[PDB]
């Protein structure tokens, strides 16, 4: 038999917010990696930081996120984190 490795359960969640970007982030930002990547970023970085993070996911890593969702996610993040 091969050797196998058992990873513990993934429990990281996005902070809920009333903004539409919350749902959109749930649907787009967990596909390649856990969302603790987002939760652990430096706090209160603001609009420009999160705009750049979102764009990098799309342009460099080829995240399938459209323009309207990208803006919604970035605004949700800049307002919440």
């Amino acid at each position: 038999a091969p050797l196998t490795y058992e990873l513990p359960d993934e429990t990281a969640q996005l902070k809920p917010a009333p903004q539409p970007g919350f749902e959109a982030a749930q649907n787009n930002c967990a596909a390649c990696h856990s969302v603790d990547y987002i939760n652990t970023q430096p706090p209160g970085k603001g609009q420009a930081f999160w705009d750049a993070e979102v764009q990098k996911m799309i342009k460099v890593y080829h995240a399938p996120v459209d323009e309207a969702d990208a803006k919604a996610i970035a605004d949700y993040l800049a307002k919440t984190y």
Binding site: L3, L7, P8, A12, C32, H33, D36, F49, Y61, H62
Partner: protein
């Protein structure tokens, strides 16, 4: 259940337990990324396998491996392509060992000011281990490197979840790869590699930042050009200058791939706000650099106004953590303790922190406030 708080903003993390590991600081779950609690570095000179830090770029890490079917492929600009089993490696080549620090490019990124994006690590993304395996030099000589060869690329079993994302592939220069120290390590601290530390085989690149130490290593390609893969050409770049640094907020005009460690040192037996007994206070800790050797470690109890020479421990090799010990007279009250190391080519730590956009290569003189009573 358990959490810790790292000493920078948004520093809360879960303590998480992975198979074969003690509880560690969980940075990310997918892919797994684990930082070592600072207290571990005061436990001894060699970092235990169950405490060793974990960093990965992509979520598609292997979770099932048959060590018997595993092959390392050697190809490209070589006379004879090779397909080597682990048993091949252990039997057909001579073994070497090296005690060497592995430290992430981004170790201590959480301390960078202004804060930058990326893995928000404290100082626990480093570790020192006894590595055993085959010098890459010997495998490459057997394949027969062609004149014309410029670089060697290294790839592992892990992969991107989405095929369009660039697969994790690194490159060394040919003369570096054939230097005799660059190693194909199948053993860490006398055991097989822990899974998350690259079971069954990894590249060990002594004195170089961790990004080069490719885990689950299965593909070696000798090429006669510069490799322009994303993880060399775009990621892991530093400012092309002596401080590897820019003015806070500024992008560099020129960059180069991250390469060799700068000089670091830490005080391990005390942490911020520790109580010590006024009088002779015994301090100890560690220092390391990129393989030139630690020449001395100085200690300060007046926030860098005056310095005392530490006594260096017997060493385990130029790539290892170098231990040190000092006894400092401390009057009652507050003291800001510092340590500063210099190496055999005269590199030392700056008193003031530098900055780059990636938050790479931090090595500022560490300060630790203690209370003497």
């Amino acid at each position: 259940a358990d959490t810790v708080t790292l000493p920078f903003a948004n520093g809360e993390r879960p303590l998480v337990m992975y198979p074969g590991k003690r509880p560690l600081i969980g940075l990310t779950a997918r892919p797994p990324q684990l930082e070592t609690p600072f207290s571990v570095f005061d436990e001894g000179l060699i970092t235990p396998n169950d405490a060793f830090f974990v960093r990965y770029a992509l979520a598609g890490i292997p979770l099932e491996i048959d060590p018997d079917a595993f092959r390392l492929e050697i190809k490209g600009k070589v006379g004879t392509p090779l397909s080597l089993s682990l048993q091949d490696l252990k039997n057909d080549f001579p073994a070497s060992e090296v005690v060497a620090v592995n430290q992430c490019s981004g170790n201590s990124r959480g301390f960078v000011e202004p804060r930058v994006g990326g893995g928000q690590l404290a100082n626990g993304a480093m570790g020192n281990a006894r590595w055993r395996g085959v010098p890459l030099k010997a495998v490459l000589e057997k394949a027969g490197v062609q004149a014309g060869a410029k670089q060697v690329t290294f790839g592992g079993l892990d992969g991107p979840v989405i095929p369009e994302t660039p697969d994790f592939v690194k490159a060394l220069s040919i003369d570096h790869a054939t230097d005799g120290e660059v190693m194909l390590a199948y053993s860490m601290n006398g055991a097989d590699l822990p899974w998350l530390n690259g079971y069954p085989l990894r590249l060990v690149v002594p004195g170089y930042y961790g990004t080069y130490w490719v885990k689950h290593l299965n593909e070696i390609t000798v090429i006669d050009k510069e490799f322009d893969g994303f993880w060399m050409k775009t990621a892991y770049r530093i400012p092309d200058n002596a401080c590897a640094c820019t003015e806070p907020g500024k992008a560099p005009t020129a960059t180069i791939p991250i390469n060799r460690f700068d000089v670091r040192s830490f005080i391990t037996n005390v942490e911020n706000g520790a109580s010590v007994k006024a009088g002779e206070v015994p301090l100890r800790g560690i220092a390391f650099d990129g393989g030139y050797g630690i020449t001395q470690v100085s200690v300060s109890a007046d926030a860098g106004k005056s310095w005392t020479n530490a006594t260096l421990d017997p060493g385990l090799g130029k790539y290892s953590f170098r231990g040190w010990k000092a006894v400092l007279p401390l009057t009652k009250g507050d003291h800001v303790l510092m340590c500063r190391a210099t190496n055999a080519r005269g590199e030392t730590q700056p008193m003031q922190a530098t900055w780059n956009p990636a938050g790479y290569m931090r090595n500022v003189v560490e300060a630790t406030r203690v209370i003497a009573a």
